[PDB]
Swiss-Prot record:
Record cross-link Glycyl lysine isopeptide (Lys-Gly) (interchain with G-Cter in ubiquitin), residues: K45
Annotated localization: Lysosome membrane; Endoplasmic reticulum membrane; Golgi apparatus membrane; Cell membrane
Source organism phylogeny: Eukaryota, Metazoa, Chordata, Craniata, Vertebrata
Family recorded in the similarity comment: Belongs to the PI3/PI4-kinase family.
Shown residues in whole-protein numbering: 2022 to 2113 of 2549
Organism: Homo sapiens
Tissue expression as described in the entry: Expressed in numerous tissues, with highest levels in testis.
Domain comment as written in the entry: The kinase domain (PI3K/PI4K) is intrinsically active but has a highly restricted catalytic center. The FAT domain forms three discontinuous subdomains of alpha-helical TPR repeats plus a single subdomain of HEAT repeats. The four domains pack sequentially to form a C-shaped a-solenoid that clamps onto the kinase domain.
Sequence segments annotated as region (Sufficient for interaction with the FKBP1A/rapamycin complex): 1-92
Paired cysteines (S-S): none
UniProt protein name: Serine/threonine-protein kinase mTOR
Quaternary structure and partners: Part of the mechanistic target of rapamycin complex 1 (mTORC1) which contains MTOR, MLST8 and RPTOR. The mTORC1 complex is a 1 Md obligate dimer of two stoichiometric heterotetramers with overall dimensions of 290 A x 210 A x 135 A. It has a rhomboid shape and a central cavity, the dimeric interfaces are formed by interlocking interactions between the two MTOR and the two RPTOR subunits.
Gene it is expressed from: MTOR
Disease: Smith-Kingsmore syndrome: An autosomal dominant syndrome characterized by intellectual disability, macrocephaly, seizures, umbilical hernia, and facial dysmorphic features. Focal cortical dysplasia 2: A form of focal cortical dysplasia, a malformation of cortical development that results in medically refractory epilepsy in the pediatric population and in adults. FCORD2 is a severe form, with onset usually in childhood, characterized by disrupted cortical lamination and specific cytological abnormalities. It is classified in 2 subtypes: type IIA characterized by dysmorphic neurons and lack of balloon cells; type IIB with dysmorphic neurons and balloon cells.
Post-translational modifications: Autophosphorylates when part of mTORC1 or mTORC2. Phosphorylation in the kinase domain modulates the interactions of MTOR with RPTOR and AKT1S1/PRAS40 and leads to increased intrinsic mTORC1 kinase activity.
Function: Serine/threonine protein kinase which is a central regulator of cellular metabolism, growth and survival in response to hormones, growth factors, nutrients, energy and stress signals. MTOR directly or indirectly regulates the phosphorylation of at least 800 proteins. Functions as part of 2 structurally and functionally distinct signaling complexes mTORC1 and mTORC2 (mTOR complex 1 and 2).
Length: 92
């Protein structure tokens, strides 16, 4: 379910950012997903997901948090490289 939630969430978040140019909408999708990671995994599958992708997703969040302070779109570009790398691996 974590793999399903992130796969669908990253897709919708990317549509809001790249398609609609809507950063607010992007963050609304991603925030709850990062928040559930912070609370921690509750099952074996969530723990395995966290093992594979947790570090990269946390770094993606830190670049988004950097954007909240800088206003610099470049910081979102860094976030999206990490998010896309995670997205590709979940698809495989």
């Amino acid at each position: 379910l974590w793999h399903e939630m992130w796969h669908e969430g990253l897709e919708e978040a990317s549509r809001l950012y790249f398609g609609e140019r809507n950063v607010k909408g992007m963050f609304e999708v991603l925030e709850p997903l990062h928040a559930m990671m912070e609370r921690g995994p509750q099952t074996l599958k969530e723990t395995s997901f966290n093992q594979a992708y947790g570090r990269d997703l946390m770094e993606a969040q830190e670049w988004c948090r950097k954007y909240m302070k800088s206003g610099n779109v470049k910081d979102l570009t860094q976030a999206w490289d990490l998010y896309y790398h995670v997205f590709r691996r979940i698809s495989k």
